[PDB]
Ligand binder design. Structure first.
Ligand SMILES: CC[C@H]1OC(=O)[C@H](C)[C@@H](O[C@H]2C[C@@](C)(OC)[C@@H](O)[C@H](C)O2)[C@H](C)[C@@H](O[C@@H]2O[C@H](C)C[C@H](N(C)C)[C@H]2O)[C@](C)(O)C[C@@H](C)C(=O)[C@H](C)[C@@H](O)[C@]1(C)O
Lengths: 209, 7, 56, 120, 114, 122
RNA sequence: AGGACCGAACCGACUAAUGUUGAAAAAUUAGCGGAUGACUUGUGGCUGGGGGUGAAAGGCCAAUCAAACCGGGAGAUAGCU
RNA sequence: ACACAGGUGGUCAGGUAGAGAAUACCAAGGCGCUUGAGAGAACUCGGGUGAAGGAACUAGGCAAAAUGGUGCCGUAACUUC
RNA sequence: AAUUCCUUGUCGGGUAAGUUCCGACCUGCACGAAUGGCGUAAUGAUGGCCAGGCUGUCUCCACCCGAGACUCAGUGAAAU
RNA sequence: CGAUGUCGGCUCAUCACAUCCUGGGGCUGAAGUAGGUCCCAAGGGUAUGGCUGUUCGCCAUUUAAAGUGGUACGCGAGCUGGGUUUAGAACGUCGUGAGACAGUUCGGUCCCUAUCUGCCGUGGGCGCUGGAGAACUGAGGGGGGCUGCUCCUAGUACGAGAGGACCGGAGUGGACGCAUCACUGGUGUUCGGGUUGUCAUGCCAAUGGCACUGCCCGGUAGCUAAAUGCGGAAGAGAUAAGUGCUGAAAGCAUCUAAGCACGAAACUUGCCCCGAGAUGAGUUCUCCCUGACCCUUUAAGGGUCCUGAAGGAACGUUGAAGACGACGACGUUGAUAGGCCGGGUGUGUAAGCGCAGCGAUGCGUUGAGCUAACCGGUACUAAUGAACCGUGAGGCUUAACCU
């Protein structure tokens, strides 16, 4: 089915009767209000578009506001689509609570990974580190050879090299859903989801068994 | 040369 | 590592397509004294946001 | 890689930094105005304003602490007698940073920092 | 951590007595022995303590049958059940890691008696 | 965390005293053995009488690791030293007949029952 | 007593990293050897080029050495480029 | 060749600790080395700490790590004693 | 063997495993007696081998403090 | 030959398939377990050590396996320089000798700041035909694709025995990968404490500097692996070798010529990520501009006054974003940062005073004192009223609706 947009408050255990520690990421899931529905008629596809947070009036632009205007406004943090599949929803700020996952056992979860900014090989690609010693001349964490000789006479595309790392999409998948709590807007999924505390999260029931 | 190389 | 051919006069220029400078525009006027000044900076005389701080 | 870290480095080592912001706290609490680079200025706050706060309660101890930092009896004295009570009622933010900008010799970005009630 | 905290303290034990590094506590931990769900007692010196709400742990050092064994209990875990102090230690030092380098007669700690 | 090389003490008779791990069995490139895993072993010390003699090559069961063990809930058990029980090369199964020092619950295996039946603890 | 011992000054130059358009046409840093002796040092003197000097490496004789440098024969000769 | 991390003989020599002209902190005295200001990436240079393991590294323990003082007790083969 | 090609000779030792090492054999390709033979205490920044300690040398790399690298201002090279 | 660094290792790779493992088959001197051999298969995976300079090889011990080759016997403007190793030296050997030797032994400078191509990242410009803010579509591209063992099926099939299945389930591992700090821990020179030498703050007492953070014990946040979550799939399409159904040419037989069914980690998908410079520049929602006037060679013509929007940018305070650009939060109608209040955490009972004691010191007040990057709060300070950029209804043709 569809999924929702939340915010990582993040990470704490909950103990069980028979004495086991279940590490859980704590996702706050305020009601998602559908800002728009989309259809094969107004070309393309079947999807809904929700918003969830709350935003400063002086920060909401004319357009963004006018878009919120169609349907129950109260402009939120941002917008997100979910593709549909024979489920249906009318736009009058339908509002979807954490209710949705009462019966779900799965859930996938997608954040924006913490930003490492650089790394170079070793961190970025787990490259091995050259002799720390033993005569090594200024080539301790360098990447070493990066091609063959005359005959490729070039470096192939996608060569593993130093560069930007993290601060990108990444999702996690599977993740047992531990607890669902409406009128608290809580969702405890078991352990570790990408992105930093406070950052936005998209959870959907898992696509895999 | 030396000659050092060788050869 | 060194060139194998003289880079051209053209190529030089190209590289400098981005080396050019920007003016300011954000030059702004003190409400008390006349005074042009950088925004969020003290004026020549020592005014800033109307008030006179700094005697110098 | 700096995530959530705090405290500027000013291209010195811990030692140099510690002694400098000591000399400067003095130079501020003394003259009540100093000219200094904006970075150096902004950090100065996290040194000075605590001292002034500390002074708001006079005891033997609180003085002796104000001396383990700053290390100048004239300034542990000006605090407590003058600045302590002089701000005894002020929530925080005993200072303000005013920017003049761009020292000649090195194009360093510059700023004034004063005690907020300087008035004089 | 305001929406946490809530989730957390509503799980915390309240009966936990106070101990202190140096004390000679005995922790009685649950154990599905094999067929029986019985209690088992671990008695040793408290050598380090947590102090993080729900996540509070502590390390107890035992010196069993030759050489030591250490157990870190997460204090607020169900599997703990009971914990009583049994002797009061005089240490002045938050972590007693130095005991690891001692042995028997050299590793005794004075009564705190106050 | 045991790994190739690494001396282990022995927690049985048989008579090994000091023993060296020459392979972490159980998988290609397997780095560490611990907990209650099996390792190939070369005797380095050996008492004079004893079932085993110095220079023998056998298997053995990690029974105490200093990095210890976790299991559920989040606790830890750490032992001050690293000890194992020698196993006969064909049948696994202790060549010894007495166990010394405490052993852990994880060892509650079909093949390692004889160890926890012996052994004065956990 | 000692071409005796440990170890600064002083004299050396075994290892490594750095440096290699250097800070330096051989050094810097950390370690290293000798350190009352065939020791080490200031000043001044003598030895000259198939000659000097050489605890001997073809070492050194002014950043030059299987024959120094400067001027000369001189526009040596070059079946080679 | 430089306002060059090099080379350059003699003279004087305080306090606290110390065997000391070692070494650490000071006095008298002399300096902060003639680009600075911010950033707090990869990598490089120079340092500090590291779970469990402990030479598995490698041509080689290269480099690091370790040892490190004084008194007393005590000390093997071998020996030109 | 600073001499052995065949050669990782063969036997013994050390190692879980040893083309090196230690001890032997003698078939010395091609030792040998002042272009000295065989020994040798002590000495050696000498060569080979082993062990205890030690450890970021390695498994496998993490974090941190400083100097560059990056940005601004001033000055302003090089080989090709 | 006015110079194409030559052995092995290290780091990083990349293709082929004559396939080492895993997958699918035919035949078997295939009972079963398990082999052999040929066919198809290149998706992924494909050992640590001893010795030696080695590659190799032998050996130890693993493993599902430890594949064969190409790539200047891939990889010196990436490292190493052990092995070839010129200036030293010695042995054996040859030589009268200087010397010489795929005989041997000890020793021995490894430059280059990247213009171009390439490659990993990241911005600027313009375009995409009025301008602008979002959300999308997904041509296309990249990533991923490994496997053990135990239990059940079942001691059943099979086998005289010994032994021991297919097929199908269920757990739990190894190596690899992504993410994250709740736990367990590392670091933590910005927190607290102990302690040596010495100098200073007049002295006691209390503190500061310097000695690697002087040495050291702990340790907050952050960053992190050894820590703990997750992943490889299931499914679908079309196939390889292969097996078939029906079936003539050829009254029969025949998988094939018509026609139909099976069929593998290869192929196209499914999963994750990028992605409209996809110039073939796409779609959807929303916001913004509705003034005057002149000149000529009179046309996507040039210009004057008014006007200056939506938005953007600049500036400021800034961030678990970051080399710089960039990206996110905030600017008083305000928690953006610092400070401040309270809490927590760390350290572990401050100073002052009292008591005991000859004193070192102990105890009381006191779990005190101090406490970074944390948490919850709080307008005390600093985020200014403005300026700047961006315009003023948006080409021709044809068609379809309406006028
Ligand atoms: C420090 C400063 C010096 O660098 C070194 O000495 C490096 C370490 C030498 O390598 C050393 C070390 C080493 C290993 O060469 C790599 C050794 O083989 C040679 C003989 O000398 C180099 C490179 C030699 O070149 C090599 O000479 C070979 C004959 C051919 C090789 N070529 C085919 C690619 C070529 O690059 C050679 C001749 O010195 C270069 C000539 C132009 C010079 O004389 C220049 C002035 C050099 O002295 C130098 C750069 O100033």
């Amino acid at each position: 089915m569809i999924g929702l947009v939340g915010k990582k408050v993040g990470m704490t255990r909950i103990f069980t009767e028979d004495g086991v520690s279940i590490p859980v990421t704590v996702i706050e899931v305020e009601a998602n209000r559908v800002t728009q529905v989309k259809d094969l008629a107004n070309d393309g596809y079947r999807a809904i578009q929700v918003t969830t947070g709350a935003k400063k009036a002086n920060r909401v632009t004319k357009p963004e506001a006018g878009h919120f205007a169609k349907a129950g406004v109260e402009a939120g943090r941002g917008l997100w689509e979910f593709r549909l599949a024979e489920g249906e929803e009318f736009t009058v700020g339908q509002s979807i609570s954490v209710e949705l996952f009462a019966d779900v056992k799965k859930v996938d979860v997608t954040g924006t990974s913490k930003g490492k900014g650089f790394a170079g090989t070793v961190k970025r690609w787990n490259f091995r580190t050259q002799d720390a010693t033993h005569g090594n001349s200024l080539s301790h964490r360098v990447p070493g050879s990066i091609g063959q000789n005359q005959t490729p006479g070039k470096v192939f595309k996608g060569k593993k090299m130093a560069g930007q790392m993290g601060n990108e999409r990444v999702t996690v998948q599977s993740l047992d859903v531990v607890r669902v709590d409406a009128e608290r807007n809580l969702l405890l999924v078991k352990g570790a989801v990408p992105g930093a505390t406070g950052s936005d999260l998209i959870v959907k029931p898992a696509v895999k068994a | 040369i030396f000659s050092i190389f060788v050869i | 590592a060194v060139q194998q051919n003289k880079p051209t006069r053209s190529k030089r220029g190209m590289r400098r397509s981005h080396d050019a400078l920007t003016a300011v525009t954000s030059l702004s006027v003190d409400k008390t004294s006349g005074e042009k000044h950088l925004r969020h900076h003290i004026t020549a005389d020592g005014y800033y946001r109307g008030r006179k701080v700094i005697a110098k | 890689m700096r995530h959530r870290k705090s405290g500027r480095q000013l291209n010195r080592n811990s030692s140099h930094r510690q002694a400098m912001f000591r000399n400067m706290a003095g130079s501020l609490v003394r003259h009540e105005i100093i000219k200094t680079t904006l970075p150096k200025a902004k950090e100065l706050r996290r040194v000075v304003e605590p001292l002034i706060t500390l002074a708001k309660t006079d005891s033997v101890a609180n003085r002796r602490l104000a001396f383990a930092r700053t290390r100048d009896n004239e300034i542990v004295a000006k605090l407590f007698n003058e600045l302590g009570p002089r701000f005894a009622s002020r929530a925080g933010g005993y200072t303000r940073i005013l920017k003049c900008g761009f020292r000649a010799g090195d194009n360093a970005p510059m700023a004034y920092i004063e005690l907020v009630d300087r008035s004089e | 951590s305001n929406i946490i905290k809530q989730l957390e303290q509503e799980q915390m034990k309240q009966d936990v007595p106070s101990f202190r590094p140096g004390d000679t506590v005995e922790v009685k931990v649950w154990v599905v022995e094999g067929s029986k769900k019985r209690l088992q007692a671990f008695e040793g010196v408290v050598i380090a303590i947590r102090n993080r709400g729900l996540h509070s742990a502590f390390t107890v050092r035992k010196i069993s049958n030759g050489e030591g064994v250490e157990r870190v209990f997460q204090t607020h875990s169900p599997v703990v059940d009971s914990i009583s102090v049994k002797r009061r230690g005089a240490v002045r030092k938050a972590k007693l890691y130095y005991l690891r380098e001692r042995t028997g007669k050299a590793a005794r700690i004075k009564e705190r008696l106050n | 965390m045991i790994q190739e090389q690494t001396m282990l003490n022995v927690a049985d008779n048989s008579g090994a005293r000091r023993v060296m791990c020459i392979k972490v069995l159980g998988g290609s490139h397997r780095r560490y053995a611990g907990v209650g895993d099996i390792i190939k072993i070369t005797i380095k010390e050996a008492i004079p009488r004893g079932k085993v003699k110095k220079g023998d090559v056998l298997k053995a069961v990690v029974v105490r690791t200093k990095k210890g063990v976790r299991r559920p809930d989040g606790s830890v058990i750490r032992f001050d030293g690293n000890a194992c029980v020698l196993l006969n090369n064909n049948s696994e199964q202790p060549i010894g007949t007495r166990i010394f020092g405490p052993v852990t619950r994880e060892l509650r295996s079909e093949k390692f029952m004889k160890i926890i039946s012996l052994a004065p603890e956990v």
